[PDB]
UniProtKB/Swiss-Prot annotation:
Top-rank lineage group of the source organism: Eukaryota
Entry's Gene Ontology cellular component terms: extracellular region
Name by which UniProt lists this protein: Basic phospholipase A2 3
Tissue-level expression: Expressed by the venom gland.
Cofactor note: Binds 1 Ca(2+) ion per subunit.
Record organism: Bungarus caeruleus
E.C. designation(s): 3.1.1.4
GO MF: calcium ion binding; calcium-dependent phospholipase A2 activity; phospholipid binding; toxin activity
Positions of Ca(2+) binding: Y26, G28, G30, D47
Keywords, sorted A to Z: Blood coagulation cascade inhibiting toxin, Calcium, Disulfide bond, Hemostasis impairing toxin, Hydrolase, Lipid degradation, Lipid metabolism, Metal-binding, Neurotoxin, Presynaptic neurotoxin, Secreted, Signal, Toxin
Active-site residue list: H46, D92
Homology family: Belongs to the phospholipase A2 family. Group I subfamily. D49 sub-subfamily.
Catalysis performed (reactions): a 1,2-diacyl-sn-glycero-3-phosphocholine + H2O = a 1-acyl-sn-glycero-3-phosphocholine + a fatty acid + H(+)
């Protein structure tokens, strides 16, 4: 679920989910071209992860509630038997950690309409 992803982000990192709304070519809705940096790669993977979650029965990325715990900065996915939840918590956990470890190039906010996302 998207609110759980929002919370994972600020669990694992200093930057909240709003930092990422407008970043690079892939962070936020949609995406085209080459991911510009490490962080843009994080979003590119996550983007594809959510897309691959539709291939699991009864699985929607935005609405699917899973089980996780946050021991700041640590995220733990609790689900084993529920494959959709297990998969989805993983997409989200992977990205929250990816976002936290990746450098934030302020130079790469607001570029989606430039020649770099081409
Ligand atoms: Cl999309
Ligand atoms: Cl498939
Ligand atoms: Cl379905």
């Amino acid at each position: 679920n998207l609110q759980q992803f929002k919370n994972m982000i600020q669990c694992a990192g200093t930057r909240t989910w709003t930092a990422y709304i407008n970043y690079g070519c892939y962070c936020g809705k949609g995406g085209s071209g080459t991911p510009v940096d490490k962080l843009d790669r994080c979003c590119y993977t996550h983007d594809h992860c959510y897309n691959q979650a539709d291939s699991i029965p009864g699985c929607n990325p935005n609405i699917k509630t899973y089980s996780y715990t946050c021991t700041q900065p640590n995220i733990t996915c609790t689900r084993t038997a529920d494959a959709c939840a297990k998969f989805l918590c993983d997409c989200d956990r992977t990205a929250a950690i990816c976002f936290a470890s990746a450098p934030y190039n302020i130079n790469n906010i607001m570029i989606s309409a430039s020649n770099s996302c081409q």
